[PDB]
């Protein structure tokens, strides 16, 4: 579970 | 001349923010550095992060969280989804921390540069970001806050005096219920109150600062503001003499009440904002009311200290981001000539190093 | 134990 997507640019 | 200065910083609707997301559950402002807004655009939930030093370039990032609160000083963000808490360093693209609670968190906030406070139905916890710390229970919730909407949690600088605030409807008015907890005494006191802050204040003649608790309440009998020292004075100190003063509501504001307080330790003034848009300024030392006016049409639902001006910054339901601070050139002649209080004028001029008391 | 007395105290 990961609440924030930081792979998104 | 006015003793305060109003400034509009932003209109969030000019950045594409839907007004349905401009409210207490979806918009957080943990300091004057950032605003975070949870929005759902199409199928995807997102957080919009407004850097207040670059506000025309907000960043949108996908999330799956029910709440997001940015650290007061750094691009480190805390997110939660039910019992799952996660902390990210955004620039490092890093998951700093993850913790799974055994209760849902109803309210949370950064209470310092490195500690998050977590409120559940039953208790309050602090969680330090230093080392491998986990949440530590501070106190159990007092039954007087049962069923309240939790709206604030504050502490003194040393995190020895803790204050939880909830509200609910009783006898057709919004009633505030506070729980003040002493970490050293392990004792709670229930207090009727709507908005509060702690402050450090060094009295003339004292070697050490006093820790003051200031709260405003609209009770059944009317509005009151209290300023009172918490704890035993440091050895050598005179105790701070407690103050209690009226908080005025005009006849047409029968249902108004206090919603936010920030204290400037630069000027030793208390800013108080009400639900329906009024601003009051009080002297911290005496509780003397310096100024009142209506400054929002719209309800202001979140505030923070405004570091640059030592004022208060806030967001209203329209999405206006607005600050109020002491107008340093006008406050002393205002107090002398409009309030006709040369004693207060002279005191504040000397206490906070302000011009204008050269003629009284 | 109470933490604060919110009423006027003539003895302090």
CATH number of the structural domain spanning residue B118: 2.130.10.110
Instruction: List all residues 6 or more positions away from B320 whose beta carbon is below 8 Å from its beta carbon.
Output: B8, B10, B11, B12, B296, B298
Do B226 and B243 form a contact (C-beta atoms < 8 A)?
yes
Q: How far apart are CA B45 and CA B24, in angstroms?
A: 17
CA distance B293 to B302: 19
Q: Are B267 and B199 contacting, i.e. CB atoms less than 8 angstroms apart? A: no
Q: Which residues contact B47 (CB under 8 A, 6 or more apart)?
A: A4, B36, B37, B38, B39, B60, B61, B63, B65, B68, B77, B79
Closest CA to B308 of B31, B109, B56: B31
- Alpha carbon B130 to chain centroid, angstroms: 24
Cα-Cα-Cα-Cα dihedral sign, residues B34, B35, B41, B43: positive
Two structure tokens written together for B222: 């009317």
Residues 78-107 on B with a CB inside 8 Å of A are 79-81, 84, 86, 88, 90, 93, 95
Which whole-number Å values give the CA distances from B305 to B36, B74, B242, B265, B266, in the listed order? 16, 16, 24, 11, 12
Provide the CB-side half-sphere exposure for C3 (13 A, CA).
24
Q: The dihedral of CA B238, B196, B107, A7: what is its sign?
A: negative
Range of the domain at B156: 1-360
Q: Is B324 exposed, middle or buried (0-12, 13-18, 19+ CB in 10 A)?
A: buried
Q: Residue B292 to residues B138, B184, B215, B217, B339: CA-CA distances in angstroms?
A: 37, 37, 17, 16, 12
Task: With CA atoms as reference, report the closest residue to B332 among B269, B279, B273, B274.
Answer: B269
Tokens of B85: 């808490």
CA dihedral sign, ordered B18, B274, B255, B292: negative
**Is the CB of A3 less than 8 angstroms away from the CB of B80?**
yes
CA dist B214 and B180 (Å) reads 12
Q: What resolution in angstrom units was achieved for this structure?
A: 1.8
Method: X-ray
Tallying the residues shown for chain B, one arrives at 360
Helices (H), B223-341: 331-337
Closest by Cα among B76, B85, B84, B79 to B62: B79
Locate B333 and state its tokens: 């002649």
Which are the contacts of B344, defined by CB distance < 8 A and separation ≥ 6? B283, B286, B288, B290, B335
Q: How far is CA B313 from CA B74, B202, B247, B268, in A?
A: 18, 25, 21, 17
B190 touches chain C (CB under 8 A): no
Q: Pull the structure tokens for residue B272.
A: 């108080």
Mutation test of the interface with chain B: which of A1, A2, A3, A8, choosing the one with the most B Cβ atoms within 10 A? A3
Residue B122 tokens, joined: 């039953």
Report the residue count for chain C: 12
B214 vs B247: CA distance, rounded Å: 13
Other residues' Cβ atoms within 10 Å of the Cβ of residue B56: 9
C-alpha span between B263 and B214 (Å, rounded) = 9
Q: How many CA atoms lie within 13 A of B131 on its CB side?
A: 4
Q: Which two tokens stand for residue B282?
A: 């009080």
Query: By C-alpha distance, which of B174, B158, B135 is closest to B256?
Result: B174
- Cβ contact, residue pair B180, C4, below 8 Å: yes
SS3 call for B143: helix
Q: In degrees, to the nearest 5, what angle opens at C-alpha B7 toward C-alphas B77 and B297?
A: 90
Is residue B230 within 8 A of residue C4, CB to CB? The reply is: yes
Q: Nearest CA to B191 among B222, B169, B158, B213?
A: B213
Out of B62, B77, B81, the one facing A5 most closely (by C-beta) is B62
Tokens, residue B194: 């709507």
CB B257 within 8 A of CB B219: no
* Rounded Cα distance, B360 and B206, in Å: 28
Distance from CA of C2 to the nearest CA of B (A): 6
Contact B287, B225 (CB under 8 A): yes
Domain count for chain B, please give it.
Answer: 1
C-alpha–C-alpha distance, residues B28 and B106, integer Å: 14
Helices and strands (DSSP H and E) totals, chain B = 2, 28
3-state SS class at B237:
coil
Those of residues 1-9 in A touching chain B at CB distance below 8 A are: 1-8
Q: Which of B148, B146, B123, B145 is nearest to B135 (CA)?
A: B123
């Amino acid at each position: 579970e990961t609440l924030l997507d930081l792979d998104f640019d | 001349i006015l003793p305060i200065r109003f400034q509009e910083h932003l209109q969030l609707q000019n950045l594409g923010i839907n007004p349905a997301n401009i409210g207490f559950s979806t918009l957080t402002m943990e300091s004057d550095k950032f605003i975070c807004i949870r929005e759902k655009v199409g199928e995807q939930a997102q957080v919009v992060i407004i850097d207040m030093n670059d506000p025309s370039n907000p960043i949108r990032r996908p999330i799956s969280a029910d709440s997001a609160i940015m650290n007061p000083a750094s691009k480190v963000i805390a997110l939660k989804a039910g019992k799952t808490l996660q902390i990210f360093n955004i620039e490092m693209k890093s998951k700093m921390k993850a913790h799974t609670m055994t209760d849902d968190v109803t309210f949370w906030k950064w209470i310092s540069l490195n500690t998050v406070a977590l409120v559940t139905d039953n208790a309050v916890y602090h969680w330090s970001m230093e080392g491998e710390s986990q949440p530590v229970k501070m106190f159990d919730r007092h039954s007087s806050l049962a069923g309240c909407q939790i709206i604030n949690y504050r502490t003194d600088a040393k995190q020895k005096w803790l204050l939880l605030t909830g509200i609910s409807a009783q006898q057709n008015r919004v009633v505030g219920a506070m729980q003040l907890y002493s970490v050293d005494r392990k004792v709670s006191q229930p207090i009727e109150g709507h908005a509060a802050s702690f402050a450090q204040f060094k009295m003339e003649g004292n070697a050490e600062e006093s820790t003051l608790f200031c709260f405003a309440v609209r009770g059944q009998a009317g509005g009151k503001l209290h300023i009172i020292e918490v704890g035993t004075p440091p050895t050598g100190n005179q105790p701070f003499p407690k103050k209690a003063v009226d908080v005025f509501f005009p006849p047409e504001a029968q249902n108004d009440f206090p919603v936010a307080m920030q204290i400037s330790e630069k000027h030793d003034v208390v800013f108080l904002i009400t639900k329906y848009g009024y601003i009051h300024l009080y002297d911290l030392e005496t509780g003397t009311c310096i100024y009142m006016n209506r400054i929002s049409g719209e309800t202001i639902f979140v505030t923070a200290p405004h570091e640059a001006t030592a004022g208060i910054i806030g967001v209203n339901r329209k999405g206006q981001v607005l600050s109020v601070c002491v107008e340093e050139e006008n406050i002393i002649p205002y107090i002398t000539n409009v309030l006709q209080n040369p004693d207060l004028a002279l005191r504040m001029a000397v206490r906070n190093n302000l011009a204008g008391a050269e003629e009284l």
